[PDB]
Amino acid sequence: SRSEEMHRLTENVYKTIMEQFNPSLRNFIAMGKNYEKALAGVTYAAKGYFDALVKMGELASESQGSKELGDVLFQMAEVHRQIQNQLEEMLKSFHNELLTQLEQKVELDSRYLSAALKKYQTEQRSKGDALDKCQAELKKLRKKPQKYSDKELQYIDAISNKQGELENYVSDGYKTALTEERRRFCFLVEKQCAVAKNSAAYHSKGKELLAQKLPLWQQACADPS
Amino acid sequence: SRSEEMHRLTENVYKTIMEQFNPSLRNFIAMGKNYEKALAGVTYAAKGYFDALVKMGELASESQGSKELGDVLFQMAEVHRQIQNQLEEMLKSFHNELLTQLEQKVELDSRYLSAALKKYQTEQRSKGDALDKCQAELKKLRKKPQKYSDKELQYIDAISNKQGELENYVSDGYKTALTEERRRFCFLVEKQCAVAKNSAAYHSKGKELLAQKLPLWQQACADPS
Amino acid sequence: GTVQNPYADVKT
Amino acid sequence: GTVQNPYADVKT
Numbered sequence: 001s002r003s004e005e006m007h008r009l010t011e012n013v014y015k016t017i018m019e020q021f022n023p024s025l026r027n028f029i030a031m032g033k034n035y036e037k038a039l040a041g042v043t044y045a046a047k048g049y050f051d052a053l054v055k056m057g058e059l060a061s062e063s064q065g066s067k068e069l070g071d072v073l074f075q076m077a078e079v080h081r082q083i084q085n086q087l088e089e090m091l092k093s094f095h096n097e098l099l100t101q102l103e104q105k106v107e108l109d110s111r112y113l114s115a116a117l118k119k120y121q122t123e124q125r126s127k128g129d130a131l132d133k134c135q136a137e138l139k140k141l142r143k144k145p146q147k148y149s150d151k152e153l154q155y156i157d158a159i160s161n162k163q164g165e166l167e168n169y170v171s172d173g174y175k176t177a178l179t180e181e182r183r184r185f186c187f188l189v190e191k192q193c194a195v196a197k198n199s200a201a202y203h204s205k206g207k208e209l210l211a212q213k214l215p216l217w218q219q220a221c222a223d224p225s
Numbered sequence: 226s227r228s229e230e231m232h233r234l235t236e237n238v239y240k241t242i243m244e245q246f247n248p249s250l251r252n253f254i255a256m257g258k259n260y261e262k263a264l265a266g267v268t269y270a271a272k273g274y275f276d277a278l279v280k281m282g283e284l285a286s287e288s289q290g291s292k293e294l295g296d297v298l299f300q301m302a303e304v305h306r307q308i309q310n311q312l313e314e315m316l317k318s319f320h321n322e323l324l325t326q327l328e329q330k331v332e333l334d335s336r337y338l339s340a341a342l343k344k345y346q347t348e349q350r351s352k353g354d355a356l357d358k359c360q361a362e363l364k365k366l367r368k369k370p371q372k373y374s375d376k377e378l379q380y381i382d383a384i385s386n387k388q389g390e391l392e393n394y395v396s397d398g399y400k401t402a403l404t405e406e407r408r409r410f411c412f413l414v415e416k417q418c419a420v421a422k423n424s425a426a427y428h429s430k431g432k433e434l435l436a437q438k439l440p441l442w443q444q445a446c447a448d449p450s
Numbered sequence: 451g452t453v454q455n456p457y458a459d460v461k462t
Numbered sequence: 463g464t465v466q467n468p469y470a471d472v473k474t
Contacts, residue, residue, distance in 0.1 A: 013288075021284055028277040031270070038263075038270035045256070045263035052253040053417070059246055060410045063238075065403045069410040076417055108456040115453045178290045183457040185285045185294040186446040190460075192278070192301055193442050196435060203431035210425040217418050221411040221473055333468040340465045408469040415472075446461055 003167055006174050007124060013177035014117035021184060022113075025106050032099050039091060046084060050077045072220045079209050086205040090198040098191045105187065116180070120173050127166040134159045228392055231399050232349060238402035239342035246409060247338075250331050257324050264316060271309060275302045297445045304434050311430040315423040323416045330412065341405070345398050352391040359384045 054077045061070030138155040148156065279302045286295030363380040373381065 024280050031273040031277040035270040035274045038267040042263040042267045045260040048256040049260045052256040055249050066407045066410045069414050072414050105456040112453050182291045182462050183460040185291045186462050187460045189294050189297050200435040203428045206428035330468040337465050407474050408472040411474050412472045
């Protein structure tokens with residue numbers, strides 16, 4: 001009986017993966033794509049900024065008395081080129097390592113989950129049917145206490161085997177469904193951890209490049225008196 | 226004579242500020258605007274990403290056996306909200322503190338530099354003219370050795386005073402022009418240093434938020450065997 | 451030929 | 463009233 005409760009729970013996990021998880025995953029992939037289209041816009045415009053800033057650098061470089069401000073501006077653009085390319089690194093961790101691999105799994109998963117649920121439903125119904133029918137055969141013999149005929153005991157053995165088989169099937173089927181769910185969330189968490197490690201390397205790079213060059217830049221226009 | 230060389234150098238510095246520096250600065254302001262329009266695109270799309278990621282979080286949260294993966298995904302979105310808002314901080318250091326103040330100075334500088342150069346040109350020509358004319362008056366007396374009349378010596382004193390006045394005027398005018406140039410590059414370098422300090426605080430924030438949470442995230446789907 | 455799980459080798 | 467330098471107070 002708790003068997004039937006478990007059977008419905010199992011059906012519900014497959015339905016939850018197919019109608020909630022995978023569509024939400026489709027949406028997450030679409031946001032990721034938008035995000036990367038945006039991030040490309042910002043990389044590009046960062047370019048035009050830092051070229052316009054090297055232009056001002058070239059002008060100072062050619063003057064009397066502001067040459068080292070020319071150097072400062074060159075270095076600010078350079079620091080940004082180094083920071084940017086630690087960002088373009090995090091960016092491809094995003095495309096090849098996250099968006100592509102999610103798209104690849106979710107594509108195959110439609111067929112895979114429709115087939116698994118269906119195979120499970122068929123097997124569970126076929127074991128249920130065979131059990132009910134053994135039980136009916138027995139109820140027939142038994143209708144027309146501590147006494148069993150040879151054939152009654154054979155039916156008893158068979159019902160006991162099929163009932164054990166059915167309960168194990170439903171028990172394992174439930175564990176397997178919960179494991180299918182956890183795998184899909186684990187993979188998602190893993191792909192996010194990998195982009196994260198690259199965000200950490202990008203932010204660490206920026207801190208140390210700036211920590212290096214900023215105090216010299218702040219000194220360039222200080223009172224020398 | 227080296228006076229005339231210095232006079233032309235001075236004219237050239239004002240021409241360089243008005244025809245090279247300020248137009249390049251106009252262009253830099255336009256790139257900065259584009260850059261900030263882009264950066265707004267990326268902040269927005271980062272939003273849609275991290276909402277789609279909280280959605281996946283909510284799903285794990287409601288399951289049997291993947292709840293703590295729900296927590297992990299919540300924390301990844303949270304870390305991103307904290308990183309983003311240290312970025313929105315660097316962003317307004319960019320708008321109110323850099324783009325606005327550059328636009329404000331370059332607006333008034335057109336009139337200011339046209340007027341300064343012009344005032345200088347007029348004063349320098351007026352001192353030159355007066356000197357030449359004193360000198361001609363003297364050459365007249367002197368035409369029709371170690372002998373000077375009272376009036377010849379008075380002209381000599383006056384020429385010497387005007388010539389000293391002219392040379393100081395050109396000498397100071399050159400120093401002042403080079404100082405006008407250096408001020409405009411200094412201000413530019415200062416506004417960039419201020420945005421930089423905020424980039425440093427944004428990258429430092431990201432490093433430490435990730436340093437904190439990443440190892441727990443990497444543990445969430447490890448073999449427990 | 452039954453259908454292969456796209457997540458077969460994902461550790462939990 | 464002569465024209466004020468937008469950069470008058472910038473340190474060098």
